[PDB]
Design a protein around this ligand. Structure first.
Ligand SMILES: [Cl-]
Ligand SMILES: [Cl-]
Lengths: 124, 124
């Protein structure tokens, strides 16, 4: 079983690019990160910062998570992100995603020792 | 019982200001929109655009909702928004919120006739 920290890395980290360079970014990344294997994951955000910078958020601003838990943290700075969301034309096994690049604060839930991101809650 | 459309208006519309003017915006708005009555709502976004502009999103870009439903719409333009999230010091009946102003696309779920916003899904 994949650990929670490793799942967060796979689903939400893309440190190899500064930003989405095209409308096809999401189709490509959702497939390669294995988020379209048995069905199309409806919504998924990738963060274009170093793993260290994203892990550091776990000691930044403590804020409520949408679900009411209190282990969420909001990044002090904005970060480059890409939101990937299925379009109307999307139908497994032909998943199709809209790519929206933005620079926003991220909010992650953190857990464990070491205390690292385990869920992506939202961006602001 | 409050209708779904009316609940969305109460929770998510603030057309009377162009933007949050201070760090106290959320404390004030969460109280006055009756979102701290019996407990502190953990997270809530207010949109600083006209009701007409927000309703118009229901005929803009159809995108997946986070929960997998297909009745979500992403605004073509960015809109002025304020995210309100409980801080660590927050404890009912003394709710306390961090105020984060941003300009972002909004994503809402739409339902009904007329086809209007009934949930705030996320911002990008
Ligand atoms: Cl996500
Ligand atoms: Cl919200």
């Amino acid at each position: 079983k994949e650990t929670a920290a490793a799942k967060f890395e796979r689903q939400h980290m893309d440190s190899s690019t500064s930003a989405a360079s095209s409308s096809n970014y999401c189709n490509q990344m959702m497939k390669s990160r294995n988020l379209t294997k048995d069905r199309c994951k409806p919504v998924n955000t990738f963060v274009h910062e170093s793993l260290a910078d994203v892990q550091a958020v776990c000691s930044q601003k403590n804020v409520a998570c949408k679900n009411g838990q209190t282990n969420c943290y909001q990044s002090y700075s904005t970060m480059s992100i890409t939101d990937c969301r299925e379009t109307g034309s999307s139908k497994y096994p032909n998943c199709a995603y809209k790519t929206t690049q933005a620079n926003k604060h991220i909010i992650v839930a953190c857990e464990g020792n070491p205390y690292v991101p385990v869920h992506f809650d939202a961006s602001v």
